[PDB]
Amino acid sequence: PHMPFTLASAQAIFAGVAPSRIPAILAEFNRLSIEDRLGLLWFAYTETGRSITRAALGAASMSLVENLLNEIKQKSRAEQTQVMIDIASRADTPISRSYGYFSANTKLGFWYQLAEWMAQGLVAPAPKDYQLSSAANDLFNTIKKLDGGQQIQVLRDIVVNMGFDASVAPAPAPKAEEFQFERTEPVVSGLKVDGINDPTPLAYFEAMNRDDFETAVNLFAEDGALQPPFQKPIVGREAILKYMREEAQGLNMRPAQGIAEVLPDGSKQLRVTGKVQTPWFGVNVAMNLAWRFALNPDGKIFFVAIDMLGSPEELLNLRPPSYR
Numbered sequence: 001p002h003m004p005f006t007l008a009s010a011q012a013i014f015a016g017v018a019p020s021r022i023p024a025i026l027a028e029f030n031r032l033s034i035e036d037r038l039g040l041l042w043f044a045y046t047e048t049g050r051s052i053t054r055a056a057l058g059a060a061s062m063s064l065v066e067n068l069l070n071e072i073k074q075k076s077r078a079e080q081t082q083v084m085i086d087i088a089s090r091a092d093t094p095i096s097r098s099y100g101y102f103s104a105n106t107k108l109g110f111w112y113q114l115a116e117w118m119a120q121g122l123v124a125p126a127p128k129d130y131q132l133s134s135a136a137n138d139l140f141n142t143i144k145k146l147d148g149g150q151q152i153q154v155l156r157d158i159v160v161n162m163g164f165d166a167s168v169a170p171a172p173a174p175k176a177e178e179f180q181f182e183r184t185e186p187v188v189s190g191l192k193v194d195g196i197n198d199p200t201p202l203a204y205f206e207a208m209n210r211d212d213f214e215t216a217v218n219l220f221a222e223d224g225a226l227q228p229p230f231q232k233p234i235v236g237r238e239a240i241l242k243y244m245r246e247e248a249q250g251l252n253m254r255p256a257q258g259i260a261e262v263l264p265d266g267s268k269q270l271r272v273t274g275k276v277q278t279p280w281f282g283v284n285v286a287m288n289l290a291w292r293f294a295l296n297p298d299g300k301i302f303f304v305a306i307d308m309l310g311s312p313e314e315l316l317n318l319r320p321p322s323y324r
């Protein structure tokens with residue numbers, strides 16, 4: 001009584017989340033000292049900071065970054081050093097709580113602008129000067145082996161999980177942290193995805209590529225879910241649309257091959273792969289992704305998982321029975 005999908009059985013399609021070195025890297029990072037973490041972030045960012053899109057965030061998000069960074073700027077070098085520690089360790093402090101309330105791209109923008117100020121000498125370069133442990137230097141080496149997309153996904157996971165959240169069920173973020181980006185490249189040309197004819201996943205890509213989230217969210221079942229890489233599923237159309245507006249806007253998605261299986265009741269499981277650009281890096285970083293779709297018999301998306309991949313070989317279709 002495989003059908004219909006539940007969230008669990010949907011999560012399990014095509015052997016579940018694509019295998020990755022990222023979880024072990026994040027777990028190892030989280031066991032380091034706070035100084036080792038900040039120092040490693042300085043070096044990790046020194047690889048990738050050149051290719052970051054300058055001036056990416058919109059006005060309202062930039063105002064939040066700049067207000068908080070102002071409060072930081074007029075602290076002493078010692079207090080500034082301590083504030084980076086408080087945020088990075090998710091300490092209960094006013095500034096760490098303020099950071100905790102930021103949507104994800106506002107958090108990334110905060111550190112971007114801080115890193116610029118650290119270069120103007122407007123803020124203490126304490127991360128630059130931290131003495132890394134062997135464990136930290138070993139982890140650095142491991143990270144440098146990841147592909148470009150994997151490296152920025154590690155940075156992102158680390159940055160967005162910083163700050164203190166005082167509430168177990170916080171409010172949705174302000175409507176001004178929505179639609180943060182303005183596109184630079186033309187919308188991706190009408191997709192041919194070798195192996196995928198089903199109109200649902202093709203409409204999904206078409207809508208997301210032109211920021212048409214009203215279309216995209218209406219492709220979901222009422223109780224449908226969207227699972228971002230190494231994140232919990234976002235469930236129902238209200239939550240999914242809010243998330244799409246906050247975090248899935250301005251992406252260029254180039255799925256190019258995939259496969260389907262039809263279940264006896266007409267449900268369908270699909271796994272599509274290809275390359276995606278984030279407005280944070282533009283054409284500079286092509287992330288290798290897989291989308292795993294579970295469709296109900298009416299063609300609605302019950303579930304879509306987005307898995308971060310690491311290699312060209314992971315783009316190919318998986319091989320039953322184990323889906324390797």
Ligand SMILES: CC1=C(/C=C/C(C)=C/C=C/C(C)=C/C=C/C=C(C)/C=C/C=C(C)/C=C/C2=C(C)C(=O)CCC2(C)C)C(C)(C)CCC1
Nearest residue numbers: 041042045108111112115127152153156228248278280306
């Ligand atoms: C901290 C720190 C520092 C500064 C760090 C800085 C400055 C880091 C900046 C990092 C940035 C900017 C990273 C951005 C990463 C963005 C990524 C990896 C985006 C991936 C997006 C994906 C994969 C989306 C795919 C999706 C698809 C395809 C769907 O179909 C549905 C939606 C969605 C799931 C969204 C300094 C140096 C001061 C030292 C002290 C500590």
